[PDB]
Ligand binder design. Structure first.
Ligand SMILES: OC[C@H]1O[C@@H](O)[C@H](O)[C@@H](O)[C@@H]1O
Ligand SMILES: OC[C@H]1O[C@@H](O)[C@H](O)[C@@H](O)[C@@H]1O
Ligand SMILES: OC[C@H]1O[C@@H](O)[C@H](O)[C@@H](O)[C@@H]1O
Ligand SMILES: OC[C@H]1O[C@@H](O)[C@H](O)[C@@H](O)[C@@H]1O
Ligand SMILES: [Mg+2]
Ligand SMILES: [Mg+2]
Ligand SMILES: [Mg+2]
Ligand SMILES: [Mg+2]
Ligand SMILES: [Mn+2]
Ligand SMILES: [Mn+2]
Ligand SMILES: [Mn+2]
Ligand SMILES: [Mn+2]
Lengths: 386, 386, 386, 386
């Protein structure tokens, strides 16, 4: 039951199952994983593919020789398993050089280095088959108000993203970029803190069609925001290039729980939306098996990610397929929401006395929305109580 | 000391000093204010102007005759005082008809009525001199996931804003629109929940140049976001058409405290930014004198709004004018942030060995940002301790 | 399926289904309910009982004559239905006189009036069968730091609660008091903001055995706290006299959604705890049918409260009864948690070399907690996926 | 100006200025500090004393020989400088063995080891002069609901604290214990999450007089709580044995900014309260110089902690000493708050017709609290604008 297969397009970062358990207040609880072993164990679990930071796959400061050997080993594991690599990203946050940012570090030479580090890994990503290249500006921001001129920082952020878009255009690459928003941590406030801010920023770039968002469940929830709503707006803009799935219990540090944990009802409505809208990108899990777990718990946690997606997928499908739910949706006028407000046009609206002068405001106010009955049908399906 | 004058461009909504003190758990503590008295008392305090909802100025359901009388009284008060009306807005939230929204109500006839209600008040706003027309979609959203198809809702929201833009274009009006974001309350989640989401949505409108944001201090803070950062991004996009100033203590219900209360340091950095960037729009206070206050406390609270702006203005000016602060800004490389990252171009960057192969990553990592010394200079100025 | 009966001990406040829908930004969407009709409709739904504020049952400012008539009507409805009244409370928040508090108002005469208002309703509560009298100090607090000396306020709060305890002792009443904590709203910060603060305060009262807590799901979640954990600590202290069940989506205004909505997984673990610990008090729903709903939606929402409790009750029971879950609990050493740490005593511990000098810290560190596998068993049961 | 001296009782943890800058997403940006150098540099800055975890002073796993040498070096630095050690604590969180807790780990042998680790360091603390021994149960809690039986966990927590109290009683030590609450991080939820929960738990211990709280500014703010209010309640209970001062910007990860940053107005009201109540314990800074800083920034940040306390101390003193503020406090009836509500007694209250039957509720409701004018006087003083 609920066994994942590659058609489900489930993917995992090397850094997820490979997280050793170091947190602000504690040392590693698990040994480091060989990327080759992760590719194999994930393939056995039914995953579609893997993702990586440059520094997950090639240890930082590697010579050309060692770099080659790490990449060759990895590609062989991908060949043995048929695992794909739909997305890759740059580590612009771990090394102390990035303590004030990469693309928006106050130090100009760091910003140039950030771009060269990213461009090198774009080449490798394209070679391995990645269709999306993710930017998470985890270090772009400040802890204090005077440390960062944010208009200048956004100048530098636009400049970097424009340069990356000129680079892929000059190479004839098909890869597109996806910004992964996060409101805070490790910086006190991070630039482009939500899906909305990232989408707005993209529209000021030179080639906006090359850039979308990679929203993460837990990150929008760290701002108390409704993650299905933000995904809906990303889909509405045509910008949902990729997505990070995990769990988060409210407004606190970034938990990265396995998907399904945290806000379970939001996970249900998210899966309902992704499936209904026909999202066809990777279902990527950016999660961390809690450091309480040994290696067997790591793989159980990763399996649980896919399992919870597939259960929720079945619950939302049954919900939508239920005639009683279809009738409830009509009773709540979800169908009227889809009708143009005034396709008859502005002048017809202005002359339409039934829209104002003769609008019976009180009869319309008295019509109950029947939202609670519909939500309890949704709850009944989610819990299997139908 | 710190006495406001009309050149300071301080404005107040009729609904602010006129808030009677009804909250979810209690009845009104103050009698209703005559708009004419508010215009006069505000003018005596040194305010530049007033704003209004349609239903603040004309009681809902007013005949043409009574409407005329309410407007004539109001204009006379504006003539006696020289008070301006730089902004107006529509009440699309109080009446029970709007319980599921205005522009995005599931009921199509409510959406049409919403638009006719707004268009009527745009005409009056333009007549009274308003340069900005604000939309706060306080009822646009949901408490439960199935109640609102958010992609369809954004269709309807775009349709309404496009119709309003066609209307002002057809009338030859100069007025522009500003979306006021709010993440939640009174709906469980509100559509376009932050400055970022509103800015992104604007770029999908037919005439994006007609639309900006009216961000509110407390609303971005209800999402835990950095309000000066969001204002910076609005300024960066050229979209800061208007601004709502008040106070908010963290993530909870919308407090609307007088400006300066709540997050005092954020208020300092906000005033520093507005003044430094040369923002020239109204400094509008969307606040509520707490219901603990009688009428004398109402006017003291409103005076306190302007007073705190002017103190903070002086502190930020002294901060920026301090040679020790100018030197600290250089020590933190705020000037390098303003320099293009790679004006020499992509190819020069790719061939620049000092940007990667020969970049001494560790020497750069060892350079301290000196952010704490700069922030303590900012703290010293804010507190008058220099 | 999942039909509630009076043995389930489900109770509702008159103010819950009777909420007319007035919120900070909107007028009532529903007509007022006759308390007699609420008693009957709730009895038909399978509820065990009702609760009330004094001013829900007798309109404020009622003469003795009218008061008598309102009470007689109500008791007759209770006689016709067999509905019980296990809890009552005082409205010390709606009337403008309480704008700075009841028991801790700065004005001494208001504090005395608060106590007389409460004592009058204790008499009625005792007559109607109430075993618990709830205090919600919704107005006790401040919006600004200088407005309330909090040590003096706690003096006054202790004085009032001591006086109430002397009153019930002098009358020979069996009724006990329960403090309902709330962190904020309508005050900027409310005194005794969480279960913990309320429990600590009780231990300074003259007769601590007369006082417990009435924790509310949404209120602890408004502080981002774990509601099952706080309930566990209340049970551990022997102080869970009563409980308020509802839903809340994170840190924002007090939503009072129907129970089961909001944090669904927390609702599961709460029901699991209440049932496992053998809590036998009322399962009281302090919720508000959203103002989008008409009267049919009001009763559907109230039914949904009980329904979700009973589904979750069945899921947690099946979870606990599962042999695979019992084995998982042993694998995670939940049984070792129940064993005394050092029943051999301090001196034996000090001389036990296996507890320090010879403790193999690394072998113990390597033992995985197997928490993820256990939680995925819990998730499987909650969703019906076993 | 604002130069700290030892009479100000400012203290710092070795782990504060000694924080190397490793965070969840990045490596250390600073070399490790020798505790002897920290003692000296802090003494030069005007600090009163230092605190430590066992593992800050003696590296984990040290032989008796090396342990002795580390302690001797440290005591010599304390002798050269006259620096005191008013508080010490145990590291029960860094080592992987504590991944599920110390005192409440599910594994019984870990709980015993936790206690032996703590008891060893109590001996050293007492020797060095510590009057308070702090327990921060950072690992006590869970990420998932089934992992921790919280009633059993509180049993184990009581058992451990009782054993520690029996140990100090058996040794004739004067040292007292202080629980440092934290709501979350590194566990998803931490047991005893706030000051209130810790105070309540203490009252169930065998010897409650031996236990108080060590509240931290940022930790209560991570729950959105009012830190001055919680301190007031701790003072009211007689339990403010110690205090941790720092800065935090709202509900997010534990920032540990230098004191004064974060919520500046809350810092003002906190200093006002501590000074007014005559708190005489250490003013301890549990903060982390941001990892953006080099060693010079570390000492500037630490100096800034004391500096901001002393500025705020002067502002609050001037506020309280202002005749205009004294008059405002009377206008807001802060003096009436201090008067007993009903020292005439219950029966006199019951027979007092002026407290109910003849209480003019509307005249009392119409009396404005004048809170805004008082708060603007407080704001004026804080900003130096008087
Ligand atoms: O850079 C991309 C990735 O970096 C990871 O280390 C972070 O945990 C993620 O937020 C992000 O998806
Ligand atoms: O509609 C515009 C205005 O409506 C007011 O009632 C709300 O309080 C504000 O958020 C908003 O500025
Ligand atoms: O006074 C007791 C009750 O008052 C109600 O109006 C509030 O909504 C509840 O928080 C509380 O249970
Ligand atoms: O154990 C006591 C101390 O441990 C430190 O590592 C934590 O940062 C503090 O929260 C605490 O004061
Ligand atoms: Mg991610
Ligand atoms: Mg506003
Ligand atoms: Mg309640
Ligand atoms: Mg601490
Ligand atoms: Mn994350
Ligand atoms: Mn607001
Ligand atoms: Mn509530
Ligand atoms: Mn901390």
């Amino acid at each position: 039951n609920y066994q994942p297969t590659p058609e489900d397009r489930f993917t995992f970062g090397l850094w997820t199952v490979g997280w050793q358990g170091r947190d602000p207040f504690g040392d590693a609880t698990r040994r480091a994983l060989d990327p080759v072993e992760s590719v194999r164990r994930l393939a056995e679990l039914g995953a579609h593919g893997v993702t990586f930071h440059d520094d997950d796959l090639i240890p930082f400061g590697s010579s050309d020789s060692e770099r080659e050997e790490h990449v060759k080993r990895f590609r062989q594991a991908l060949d043995d398993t048929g695992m794909k690599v739909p997305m890759a990203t740059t580590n612009l946050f771990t090394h102390p050089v990035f303590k004030d940012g990469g693309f928006t570090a106050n130090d100009r030479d760091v910003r140039r280095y950030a771009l060269r580090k990213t461009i090198r890994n774009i080449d490798l990503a394209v070679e391995l088959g990645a269709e999306t290249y993710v930017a998470w500006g985890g270090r772009e921001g400040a802890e204090s108000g005077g440390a960062k001129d944010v208009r200048d920082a956004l100048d530098r952020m636009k400049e970097a993203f424009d340069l990356l878009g000129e680079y892929v255009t000059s190479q004839g690459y098909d890869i597109r970029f996806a910004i992964e928003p996060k409101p805070n941590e490790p910086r006190g406030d991070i630039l482009l803190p939500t899906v909305g801010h990232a989408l707005a920023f993209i529209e000021r770039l030179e080639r906006p069609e090359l850039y979308g968002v990679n929203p993460e469940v837990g990150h929008e929830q760290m701002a108390g925001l409704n993650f299905p709503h933000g995904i809906a707006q990303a889909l509405w803009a045509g910008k949902l290039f990729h997505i990070d799935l995990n769990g988060q219990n409210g407004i606190k540090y970034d938990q990265d729980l396995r998907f399904g944990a945290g806000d379970l009802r939001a996970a249900f409505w998210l899966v309902d939306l992704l499936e209904s809208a026909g999202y066809s990108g990777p279902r990527h899990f950016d999660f961390k098996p809690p450091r309480t777990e040994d290696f067997d718990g790591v793989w159980a946690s990763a399996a649980g990610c896919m399992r919870n997606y597939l259960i929720l997928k079945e619950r939302a499908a049954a919900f939508r397929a239920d005639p009683e739910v279809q009738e409830a949706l009509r009773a709540s006028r979800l169908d009227e929401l889809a009708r143009p407000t005034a396709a008859d046009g502005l002048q017809a609206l202005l002359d339409d006395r039934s829209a104002f002068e003769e609008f019976d405001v009180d009869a319309a106010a008295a019509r109950g929305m029947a939202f609670e009955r519909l939500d309890q049908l949704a709850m009944d399906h989610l819990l299997g109580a139908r």
